[PDB]
Amino acid sequence: KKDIGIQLYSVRDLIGSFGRNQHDYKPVLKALADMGYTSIEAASYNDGKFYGNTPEEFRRDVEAVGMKVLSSHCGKGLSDEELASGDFSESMKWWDQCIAAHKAAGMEYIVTPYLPVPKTLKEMQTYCDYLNAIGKKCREAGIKYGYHNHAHEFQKIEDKAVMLDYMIENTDPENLFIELDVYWAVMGKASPVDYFHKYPGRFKMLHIKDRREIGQSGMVGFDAIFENAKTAGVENIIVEVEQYSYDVEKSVKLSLDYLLEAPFVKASYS
Amino acid sequence: KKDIGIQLYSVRDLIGSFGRNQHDYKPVLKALADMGYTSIEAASYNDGKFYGNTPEEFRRDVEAVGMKVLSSHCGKGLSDEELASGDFSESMKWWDQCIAAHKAAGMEYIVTPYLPVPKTLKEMQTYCDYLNAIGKKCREAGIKYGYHNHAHEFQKIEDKAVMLDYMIENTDPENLFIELDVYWAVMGKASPVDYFHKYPGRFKMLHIKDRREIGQSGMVGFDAIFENAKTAGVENIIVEVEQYSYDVEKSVKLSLDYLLEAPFVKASYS
Ligand SMILES: OC[C@H]1O[C@H](O)[C@H](O)[C@@H](O)[C@@H]1O
Ligand SMILES: OC[C@H]1O[C@H](O)[C@H](O)[C@@H](O)[C@@H]1O
Numbered sequence: 001k002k003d004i005g006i007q008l009y010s011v012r013d014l015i016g017s018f019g020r021n022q023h024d025y026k027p028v029l030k031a032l033a034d035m036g037y038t039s040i041e042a043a044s045y046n047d048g049k050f051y052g053n054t055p056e057e058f059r060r061d062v063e064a065v066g067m068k069v070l071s072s073h074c075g076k077g078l079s080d081e082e083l084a085s086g087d088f089s090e091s092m093k094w095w096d097q098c099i100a101a102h103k104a105a106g107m108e109y110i111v112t113p114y115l116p117v118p119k120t121l122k123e124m125q126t127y128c129d130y131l132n133a134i135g136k137k138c139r140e141a142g143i144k145y146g147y148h149n150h151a152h153e154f155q156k157i158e159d160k161a162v163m164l165d166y167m168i169e170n171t172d173p174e175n176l177f178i179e180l181d182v183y184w185a186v187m188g189k190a191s192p193v194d195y196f197h198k199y200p201g202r203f204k205m206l207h208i209k210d211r212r213e214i215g216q217s218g219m220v221g222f223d224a225i226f227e228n229a230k231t232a233g234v235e236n237i238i239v240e241v242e243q244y245s246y247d248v249e250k251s252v253k254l255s256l257d258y259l260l261e262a263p264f265v266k267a268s269y270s
Numbered sequence: 271k272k273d274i275g276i277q278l279y280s281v282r283d284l285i286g287s288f289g290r291n292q293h294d295y296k297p298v299l300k301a302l303a304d305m306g307y308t309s310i311e312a313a314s315y316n317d318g319k320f321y322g323n324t325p326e327e328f329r330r331d332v333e334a335v336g337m338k339v340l341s342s343h344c345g346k347g348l349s350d351e352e353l354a355s356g357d358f359s360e361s362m363k364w365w366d367q368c369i370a371a372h373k374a375a376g377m378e379y380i381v382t383p384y385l386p387v388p389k390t391l392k393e394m395q396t397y398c399d400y401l402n403a404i405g406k407k408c409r410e411a412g413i414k415y416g417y418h419n420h421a422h423e424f425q426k427i428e429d430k431a432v433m434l435d436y437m438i439e440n441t442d443p444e445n446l447f448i449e450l451d452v453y454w455a456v457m458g459k460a461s462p463v464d465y466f467h468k469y470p471g472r473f474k475m476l477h478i479k480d481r482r483e484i485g486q487s488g489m490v491g492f493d494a495i496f497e498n499a500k501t502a503g504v505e506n507i508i509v510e511v512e513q514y515s516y517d518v519e520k521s522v523k524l525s526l527d528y529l530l531e532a533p534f535v536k537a538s539y540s
């Protein structure tokens with residue numbers, strides 16, 4: 001028995017994602033709960049609602065099956081006009097709605113799942129200003145704002161700064177943490193542990209992800225990752241499975257069991 | 271105690287010179303033995319000799335510190351002329367000397383450490399013919415010939431075949447096994463375990479390598495790899511460390527200790 005979360009993207013084939021393919025998510029929530037997942041990270045926020053439901057109903061539904069309503073992936077990128085002007089004030093109204101909806105749902109974190117590699121350091125800097133501004137507003141609402149990587153953030157901008165490094169270095173720790181996707185970090189030739197040591201404390205959440213089932217490909221050193229979890233600053237871990245050797249239910253269950261069986265995964269990080 | 275080998279390349283910096291001795295490997299042999307490595311893979315074959323010594327002297331030296339003289343990296347790429355002619359006859363006499371020297375040293379395996387990505391499938395085919403021919407000669411001297419990868423072998427040739435796949439598919443199992451470098455496979459976006467399942471029995475040795483010390487980076491899933499070792503066909507494992515967080519002795523000892531401590535690493539694979 002360990003505190004292990006689940007990215008609801010993992011079951012998007014059953015409940016949908018990012019505003020589409022919707023089903024009644026409640027039976028799946030129950031199965032995930034019964035498997036022994038203890039928290040959820042959502043993957044379908046839109047216009048004040050979660051999977052089409054009010055924050056109150058979503059919170060109730062998640063609470064009904066005994067899981068923590070922990071985190072949520074959602075975001076709003078800057079238009080080319082906002083990037084060129086450096087003025088992203090119109091975007092902030094969307095965040096007032098988003099932050100109030102997350103607070104009503106009980107959420108502890110909000111994580112932006114994706115930003116494009118910008119063309120220039122100046123653009124990156126504007127993104128940093130935006131991330132700081134979002135994270136500050138989140139912080140005032142009692143929420144921790146984070147960023148989730150794929151592999152593209154390990155590229156360089158203007159052949160100077162690695163994008164993820166720039167973001168980390170040019171955001172305030174209390175405004176932005178990194179929800180590090182260890183699979184995608186490895187895919188971008190990055191050492192998760194080396195990142196942990198370069199930016200201690202900034203990795204408040206991990207996406208525990210692999211090619212398919214967690215711990216099956218040989219491509220991720222979860223032992224080392226979890227051994228350096230204190231340096232990283234890990235508070236919570238979120239299993240993500242996007243591709244499957246089996247039916248989805250079994251893939252996500254085997255994924256949890258790997259962590260439950262792993263001696264290097266502690267019962268709680270919080 | 272576990273049967274764990276060491277690639278002598280890993281301590282290339284600790285093999286020095288004084289007086290008439292240009293490759294004084296004996297002190298390092300001792301140290302490696304004392305750390306607890308049980309077998310060596312050589313990285314210095316030329317002109318019938320190992321580290322400038324006769325096969326009998328090298329064999330004596332290795333045996334004197336109680337390690338197995340197991341394997342050896344050496345190679346002879348095809349010239350552009352041999353590639354274009356398809357006729358690699360001239361290279362085969364080099365192999366007669368090489369194989370006889372390995373037999374005199376007691377070697378169980380010979381492994382070629384690098385072949386370039388060829389431009390065409392036709393050239394890849396020629397390489398496979400060459401590998402088959404070498405492996406056949408090795409086999410008749412009671413030696414198993416193998417191929418060691420980096421990352422480049424996961425590229426596609428003519429945007430058709432992945433190079434390593436082509437090699438495996440178009441060589442005889444009895445002529446060629448793969449000494450899979452798990453670190454470099456990951457660096458090529460390859461799952462070691464999926465390779466094991468695609469080509470059962472063909473990975474008779476692993477190069478146990480990481481970014482630096484074995485098991486420290488978070489980039490290699492040793493647990494999964496070792497759990498699939500039987501499928502793979504693993505007979506021996508060889509630690510390789512080329513880059514170091516510490517002084518070389520400490521780095522290669524920490525590397526052994528990770529495997530000695532890992533419950534998923536068995537005492538013997540042979
Ligand atoms: O809550 C009060 C404080 O927080 C506000 O968001 C303002 O940024 C700051 O100027 C003010 O003093
Ligand atoms: O931390 C900045 C960059 O340099 C590091 O040495 C790593 O090689 C790379 O993975 C990382 O993106």
Ligand SMILES: OC[C@H]1O[C@H](O)[C@H](O)[C@@H](O)[C@@H]1O
Nearest residue numbers: 277279312313343383418510
């Ligand atoms: O052959 C000994 C060593 O030398 C080569 O340069 C390879 O990079 C390495 O994979 C090998 O272990």
Ligand SMILES: OC[C@H]1O[C@H](O)[C@H](O)[C@@H](O)[C@@H]1O
Nearest residue numbers: 391430431432435436439440
């Ligand atoms: O024999 C030639 C063919 O066999 C190889 O194993 C591959 O399947 C294919 O890509 C190649 O063209």
Ligand SMILES: OC[C@H]1O[C@H](O)[C@H](O)[C@@H](O)[C@@H]1O
Nearest residue numbers: 424432435458459460461468
């Ligand atoms: O083995 C075949 C190739 O295709 C697979 O789908 C993998 O993505 C790749 O790592 C591998 O090289």
Ligand SMILES: [Co+2]
Nearest residue numbers: 181207209240
């Ligand atoms: Co993810």
Ligand SMILES: [Co+2]
Nearest residue numbers: 451477479510
């Ligand atoms: Co190697």
